[PDB]
Amino acid sequence: TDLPRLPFDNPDIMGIAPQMLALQKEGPIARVGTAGEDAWLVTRYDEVRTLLADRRLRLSNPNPQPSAKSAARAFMVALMAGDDHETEPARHAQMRSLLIPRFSTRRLRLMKTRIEHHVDELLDQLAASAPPVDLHRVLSFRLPTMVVCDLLGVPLADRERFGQWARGTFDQSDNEHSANTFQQVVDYMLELVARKRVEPGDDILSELIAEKDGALSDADIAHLGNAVLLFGYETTIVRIDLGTLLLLRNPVQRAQLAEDPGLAPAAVEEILRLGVGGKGSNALIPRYAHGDITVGETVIRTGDAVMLAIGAANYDDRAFPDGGLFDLTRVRPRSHLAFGHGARHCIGRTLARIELTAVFERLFRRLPDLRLAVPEESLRWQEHRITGGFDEIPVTF
Ligand code: HEM
Ligand SMILES: CC1(C)C[C@H]2C[C@@H](C(=O)O)[C@@H]3COC(=O)[C@]4(CO4)[C@]23C1
């Protein structure tokens, strides 16, 4: 009898921690310790997918005196309209109503074309340079920040201003750094909303300003833009790094994709499903029970914290045969959980898929000999950031 304690050790730089796979083998749900409060950990695909669609399980904390959070997590939860359990239903509903139509088929079609040319240009610069090159700096970081510049209608050079702000806002190890960085994000976005009020374009804030004959306050609009800025590039950067690392580990699938870029959508779904870094703390979706819920033979009581392990569920042999294997030839694979599911299903997921598809359509066709210039074990996953990630990916080609 030994209460398991999150985060679990991972001897590899990717994948799921052995202890979490061991718990998954025993059953769908276990009581675990964490850095803060104890929580129920749900590790099997069927139960994680079910609980994500259960409206009794919500982001907001209903408890009368809530456990303390890092500044980073508090900012995250506020950007997701989960900071007040009494107003979360109306506020979260409004958030999704206002953001979903910003990712229209018209906008996505136009952005796919620009994304494709941009990747072409990024790879031509990469191919013209002398190895070793940091693939994270010159490819992974550059495409998703370009996309956010396009969404917000700002010059591309602005990403050199905001490109580290998600990392800094979400630094759980330094409350003061987190708050100072979020203040910069806020100041920037308020500047931007004031400009878009007199100089609109074909971009997200201009559409928010025009919404409901202009009924939204500057604070309301900047909130929504901050969510786009802070959720809209960093996680995608990390998936380009993880997808590259995964394809480097699987040369047969990599050669298949290089030969047939029509496999890129399938590859991207495998990358999302298998792409978990380090101790994988970002592959947990946190919730609180707002009513009692029975999971198998376990009773989750109102007020309990629940960690929905989307990473472990995406590796679950019960949902994906040979769940640990990268196989872009899977026939009708189940929908992975990397974007979540239910009420908070990732608003940007179609755009993120467009970005990743454009990259991996091209990468190994344009640079067939691309490979790591350093050992895998020297790559350092950044555990203190809510979004994790690697700081550099040195390559040769
Ligand atoms: C590969 C890249 C991405 C991954 C893996 C990812 C993953 C996720 C996940 C798992 C959630 C649900 C969190 C929860 O249920 O607590 C989420 C929510 C969200 N995502 Fe994404 N995301 C990605 C990219 C993006 C992009 C590109 C955008 C927009 C430009 C975006 C905007 C959002 C927003 C606004 C939410 C909040 C939805 C809500 O709370 O209702 N994300 N994302
Ligand atoms: C709004 C988010 C940025 C979306 C998810 C992406 C995930 C990641 O970075 O992989 C990040 C980590 O922390 C979480 O609570 C997650 C899992 O819900 C998120 C929060």
UniProtKB/Swiss-Prot annotation:
Names of required cofactors: heme
CDD domains assigned: Cyp158A-like
Pfam families the UniProt entry points to: p450
EC number of this enzyme: 1.14.19.8
This protein's pathway: Antibiotic biosynthesis; pentalenolactone biosynthesis
Keyword Iron belongs to the record: yes
Binding site for heme: 346
InterPro entries, per database record: Cyt_P450, Cyt_P450_B, Cyt_P450_CS, Cyt_P450_sf, PentlenlactSyn
Top enzyme category: oxidoreductase
Protein name: Pentalenolactone synthase
Record lineage: Bacteria, Bacillati, Actinomycetota, Actinomycetes, Kitasatosporales
Protein encoded by which gene: pntM
